[PDB]
Write a protein that binds this ligand. Structure first.
Ligand SMILES: CCCCCCCCCCCCCCCCCC(=O)OC[C@H](COP(=O)([O-])OCC[N+](C)(C)C)OC(=O)CCCCCCCCCCCCCCCCC
Ligand SMILES: CC(C)CCC[C@@H](C)[C@H]1CC[C@H]2[C@@H]3CC=C4C[C@@H](OC(=O)CCC(=O)O)CC[C@]4(C)[C@H]3CC[C@]12C
Ligand SMILES: CC(C)CCC[C@@H](C)[C@H]1CC[C@H]2[C@@H]3CC=C4C[C@@H](OC(=O)CCC(=O)O)CC[C@]4(C)[C@H]3CC[C@]12C
Ligand SMILES: CC(C)CCC[C@@H](C)[C@H]1CC[C@H]2[C@@H]3CC=C4C[C@@H](OC(=O)CCC(=O)O)CC[C@]4(C)[C@H]3CC[C@]12C
Ligand SMILES: CCCCCCCCCCCCO[C@@H]1O[C@H](CO)[C@@H](O[C@H]2O[C@H](CO)[C@@H](O)[C@H](O)[C@H]2O)[C@H](O)[C@H]1O
Ligand code: ALF
Ligand SMILES: [Mg+2]
Length: 1030
């Protein structure tokens, strides 16, 4: 359901809105960006939809759209046009304008569209272009830079500039500015790349009423134009229906398969033309026409049905354009409420301490920046930068490094079959000869055959030509001739190293007979030899019944039930004289009759050598591998059993759904096919029928579905989205244009292609194997572990500084600008960068990292470490006050005037060690990272900073002038402080170990969680309890 709200404008009201939102305050702009309803109710008056100039489109999601008048009122919502029909008084979508018009209606368009008609239809539908918007850098910045965090960072920078904290403000400002500039550049470059990808400019020939023909740009195409298709082929500029002639189309952009698809003219009937019902008569935008035949009439005719975004390619592009962090944000909000409480206490004590008002405000507001660290996201990003560098070294290119963290959450990866799991093209599996009347064993090496009829039939029965000293022609012909070892030189062929045979004539391959004929001869022969090659069931009807085996159909189906490309070959001795004076005057029908079937050639798309190891490694780590292919279900099932997606002990069930016809509803048919433990296999049609008519059975299908074949690109996207609705973290790995929606919609989409799929995918790999998936999963698990560690350190760091500054505020002192700077810059930056440094573990494990920062382990660790930190700091403070040499701090003045003093000195000396202790304690090794002792730079940095601090404590006058520290002459007290920090070190490491070891066991044995939050785990539970298909 949708709702259209109409708003006009008043100039006085427009100026009034602008002044009230600009001169009064800047906050109203952000308030209106957070809810645009108030902004549109203030700036625009409500107007009747017939006069509206602004519409609020709400689907809950709210959108605002400007209404454009040519007259023709219309608007664009997500690339789709909604023209205003005055007679019906509504904004009707242009996709529905000629919906349900008959096949005779399409056929009457074969004479073309006039110029007046084309102009009105271009006014209505627009140009035949997929127009992708590339925003300007200000327009692009308003989206990102208005992040709430960036506002908090701006507030903190302004505060630090008001507080003479210039250097850390400059560091934070530089980091944020470079990050924003990089994000803007990346987004604009990706937009420009996608725009260049979807752009299609070409000259097309359209029929015009009166018999004429006009060459126009493909953008001038409107629904109702009659395209004149080139006989030589080419890219299809729009969606069309064939009304005259036939075509051979490469539909890999829709299916991923380069096999030629035959398109025939639409049938003339009084029934509504449908792109799915008449898919075999429809030419889709972006697909490649290989050749077009005009049997009746001069030229091949197609009637334009959909242009622009209304094409299937346009729908895919629109889906691409218009589709841990939660707990991080909630923890930051909790840090903010703690900031409010600490600010109240700070105001109270500073007013007690007789601090001036402006200084009270500065201190209380600086406490907020203290407890909420402005440098948290950069610290979280450093680990993803390390992971991205490692991945680029391994050949995997990531455009957004923060997407790497999602690799640690993946429980399911979807795979395209062709080019991703299997090779791009077919390979010669063998040739099946015939001895006598029965089949022979399959011969994997056709050149190992003797020099007989079948070898020369494989070698010379084709239509290849030599070009650039390289054979060019039919691809399967090229591969079989490469297999035979014979080299091309009508034509002649030399054996692999026999007698070189020369072709005497050749009859072309026609799509009607779907078979080819040649006539060959050689010196030392008795008579010429004619070869025939084509569809095996069609060649079998021409040979003698005493040559075709009785097991022919069964063997052919056994071959083709696995997705093999069988092609038969036959031959004939001809009583013709061995001369071209009679051999070129043969009619082909006499050659096709009385054949002798020589055998079959079996071609298959082989599984890549890296596929089965990776799939078995994924299944061993309990990650679901799902085949989502555009190919047929038999090939998909065979490849899924081949790559180990379906183990031989496991059961596969085909789910077949039937459309609800007149009088009976849709039904689900389950047919178990002989060889988790239960896998489901279904087609695109079945997937759609289940999505529409069985929405309660759909989750079980998605939880048990392993093979999804014959899927359209939007169906791949829908599968990815429906699996994400089950709370899966979904990965997609594909290499085709039909995979772009699923690669953009997936959490981790890896592109095996460098063209037209690299644009929309977060990750691109230079290797054509799926070995990138375990690499990305390992790097993502390492990055998620490292990000947990860095977040825990920054939280502990924020709290430690909070406790320090509170203890010091209570006595009317502070830490010190240079002590603040040491802690903020030197310690914290060194620690964050060298924590993020370590790489991933070498082995994938079955257990994956936690994806929740609000977990009980994380919160318990933080709380206990902070208890120990607060205890050590308060104990050192109260031990300092108990000393005989201790003197109070002259509370009459405030910091930094009362510095140096013993209290700040001891508090800083303790907390500065605590930062390194917590840094070392939150860091982890196994199972998702390399061992912590291998991080030699980090350990050396910890030791060096510890030695610097031990010098600050022990060596008199060491940096005490700069850091405004007080000299303590009691060496026993300094040794007591060092023993206290050693206590904190040992206690922090023991706390981390005790938690990481015994907290899971206690959480399990104490309160058992029988039900997971994940929807798919609950579905797996209830399927284990009650298996759905009985
Ligand atoms: C001083 C700045 C010099 C170094 C900046 C390097 C920028 C970079 O390569 O990162 C891009 C990345 C890309 O992120 P993205 O958001 O574009 O993706 O973003 C950053 O600049 C993060 C900077 C990390 C440094 C933070 C250190 C603080 C430790 C506490
Ligand atoms: C406030 C200021 C002073 C902070 C400055 C911090 C920078 C010096 C940090 C932030 C990100 C760090 C980078 C994070 C990622 C990497 C990748 C790393 O290279 C690899 O990981 C290759 C490994 C492989 O391919 O096997 C080299 C260090 C480097 C550039 C780090 C260099 C130091 C950087 C630039
Ligand atoms: C007057 C005082 C308060 C100013 C201190 C100067 C800082 C700008 C210096 C002191 C310590 C320096 C840090 C020393 C250690 C590191 C780790 C280093 O990491 C790497 O080189 C990556 C190599 C790898 O991982 O392979 C990046 C620079 C950085 C953060 C340096 C950034 C600049 C720092 C913060
Ligand atoms: C006055 C100066 C010289 C003080 C020196 C302090 C050092 C003795 C501290 C600083 C950092 C500490 C290191 C911090 C962390 C590690 C990793 C830790 O390894 C493990 O926890 C096992 C599993 C894993 O590596 O993940 C072993 C101790 C060690 C080297 C610590 C050993 C003692 C170190 C070197
Ligand atoms: C991890 C610990 C890092 C400690 C880093 C300390 C480095 C500081 C060196 C900068 C020196 C500035 O020099 C110092 O300036 C301060 C003002 O701040 C003056 O006060 C001091 O008298 C002067 O000695
Ligand atoms: F390459 Al595919 F489905 F196998 F698009
Ligand atoms: Mg593919």
């Amino acid at each position: 359901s949708v709702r259209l709200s109409g708003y006009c404008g008043s100039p006085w009201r427009v100026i009034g809105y602008h002044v009230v939102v600009w001169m009064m305050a800047g906050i109203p702009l952000l308030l209106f960006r957070w809810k645009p309803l108030w902004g549109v109710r203030l700036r625009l008056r409500p107007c009747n939809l017939a006069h509206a100039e602004t519409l609020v489109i709400e689907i809950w999601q709210l959108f605002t759209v400007q209404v454009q008048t040519e007259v023709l009122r219309y608007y664009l919502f997500q690339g789709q046009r909604y023209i205003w029909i005055e007679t019906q008084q509504a904004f009707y979508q242009v996709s529905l304008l000629d919906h349900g018009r008959s096949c005779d209606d399409v056929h009457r368009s074969r004479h073309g569209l006039s110029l007046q008609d084309q102009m009105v239809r271009k006014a209505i539908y627009g140009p035949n272009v997929i127009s992708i918007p590339v925003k300007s850098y200000p327009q692009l910045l308003v989206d990102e830079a208005l992040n709430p965090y960036y506002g908090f960072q701006a507030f903190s920078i302004a505060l630090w500039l008001a507080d003479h904290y210039y250097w850390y403000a400059l560091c934070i400002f530089l980091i944020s500015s470079i990050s924003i500039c990089l994000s803007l550049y990346k987004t604009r470059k990706q937009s420009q790349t996608l725009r260049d990808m979807v752009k299609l400019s070409m000259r097309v020939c359209v029929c015009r009423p009166g018999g004429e023909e006009e060459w126009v740009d493909s953008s001038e195409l409107v629904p109702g134009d009659c395209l004149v298709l080139p006989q030589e082929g080419g890219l299809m500029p729009c969606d069309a229906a064939l009304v005259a002639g036939e075509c051979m189309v490469n539909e890999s952009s829709l299916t991923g398969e380069s096999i030629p698809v035959l398109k025939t003219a639409l049938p003339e009937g009084l029934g509504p033309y449908c792109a799915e019902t008449h898919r075999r008569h429809t030419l889709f935008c972006g697909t490649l026409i290989l050749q077009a035949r005009a049997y009746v009439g001069p030229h091949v005719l197609a009637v334009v049905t959909r242009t622009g975004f209304c094409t299937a390619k346009g729908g895919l592009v629109s889906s691409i354009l218009h589709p841990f962090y939660k707990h991080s944000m909630k923890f930051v909000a909790a840090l903010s409420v703690l900031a409010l409480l600490g600010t109240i206490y700070s105001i109270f004590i500073l007013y007690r301490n007789r601090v001036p008002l402006n200084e009270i405000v500065i201190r209380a507001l600086d406490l907020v920046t203290v407890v909420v660290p402005p440098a948290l996201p950069a610290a979280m990003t450093v680990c993803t930068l390390y992971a991205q560098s490692r991945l680029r070294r391994q050949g995997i290119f990531c455009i957004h490094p923060l997407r790497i963290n999602l690799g640690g959450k993946l429980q399911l990866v979807c795979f395209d079959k062709t080019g991703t799991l299997t090779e791009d093209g077919l390979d010669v599996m063998g040739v099946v000869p015939l001895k006598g009347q029965a089949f022979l064993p399959l011969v994997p090496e056709p050149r190992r055959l003797p020099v007989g009829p079948l070898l020369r039939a494989l070698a010379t029965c084709h239509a290849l030509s030599r070009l650039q000293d390289t054979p060019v022609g039919d691809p399967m012909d090229l591969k079989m001739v490469e297999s035979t070892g014979w080299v091309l030189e009508d034509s002649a062929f030399g054996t692999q190293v026999p007698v070189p045979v020369s072709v005497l004539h050749r009859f072309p391959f026609s799509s009607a007979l779907q078979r080819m004929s040649v006539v060959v001869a050689w010196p030392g022969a008795t008579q010429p030899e004619a070869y025939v090659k084509g569809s095996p069931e069609l060649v079998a009807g021409l040979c003698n019944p005493e040559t075709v085996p009785t097991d022919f159909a069964q063997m052919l189906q056994s071959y083709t039930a696995a997705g093999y490309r069988v092609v038969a070959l036959a031959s004939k001795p001809l009583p013709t004289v061995p001369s071209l004076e009679a051999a070129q005057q043969l009619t082909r029908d006499t050659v096709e009759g009385d054949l002798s079937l020589l055998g079959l050639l079996v071609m298959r798309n082989l599984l890549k050598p890296q596929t089965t190891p990776v799939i078995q490694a994924l299944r061993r780590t309990r990650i679901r591998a799902v085949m989502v292919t555009g190919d047929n279900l038999q090939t998909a099932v065979t490849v899924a059993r081949g790559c180990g997606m379906v183990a031989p002990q496991e059961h596969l069930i085909i789910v077949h759904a039937t459309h609800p016809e007149r009088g009976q509803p849709a039904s689900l048919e389950f047919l178990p096919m002989e060889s988790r433990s239960r896998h489901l296999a279904l087609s695109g049609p079945t997937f759609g029928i289940i999505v529409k008519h069985f929405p309660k059975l759909l989750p079980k299908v998605l939880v048990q579905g392993t093979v999804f074949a014959r899927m359209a690109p939007e169906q791949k996207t829908e599968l990815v989205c429906e699996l994400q609705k089950l709370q899966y973290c979904v990965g997609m790995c594909g290499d085709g244009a039909n995979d772009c929606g699923a690669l953009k919609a997936a959490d981790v989409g890896i592109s095996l292609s460098q063209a037209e799929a690299s644009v929309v995918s977060p990750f691109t790999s230079s290797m054509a194997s799926i070995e990138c998936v375990p690499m990305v999963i390992r790097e993502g698990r390492c990055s998620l572990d490292t990000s947990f560690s860095v977040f825990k350190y920054m939280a502990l760091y924020s709290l430690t500084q909070f406790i320090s500054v509170l203890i010091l505020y209570t006595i009317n002192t502070n830490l010190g600008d240079l002590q603040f700077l040491a802690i903020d810059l030197v310690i914290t930056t060194t620690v964050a960068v060298l924590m993020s440094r370590t790489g991933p573990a070498l082995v994938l494990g079955r257990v994956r990292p936690p994806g929740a920062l609000l977990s009980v382990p994380v919160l318990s660790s933080l709380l206990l470490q902070m208890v120990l930190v607060t205890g050590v700091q308060l104990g050192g403070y109260f031990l300092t006050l108990a000393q005989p040499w201790f003197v109070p701090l002259n509370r009459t003045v405030a910091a930094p005037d009362n510095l140096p003093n013993y209290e700040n000195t001891v508090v800083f000396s303790l907390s500065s060690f605590q930062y390194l202790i917590l840094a070392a304690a939150v860091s982890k090794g196994a199972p998702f990272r390399r061992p912590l002792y291998t991080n030699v730079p980090f350990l050396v940095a910890l030791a060096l900073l510890s030695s610097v601090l031990v010098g600050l404590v022990l060596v008199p006058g060491l940096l005490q002038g700069p850091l405004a520290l007080r000299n303590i002459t009691d060496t026993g007290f300094k040794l007591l402080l060092l023993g206290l920090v050693t206590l904190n070190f040992v206690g922090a490491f023991m706390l981390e170990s005790v938690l990481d070891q015994c907290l899971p066991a206690c959480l399990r044995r104490l309160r058992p969680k029988r039900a997971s939050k994940k929807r798919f785990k609950q579905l797996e539970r209830e399927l284990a309890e009650q298996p759905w298909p009985p």
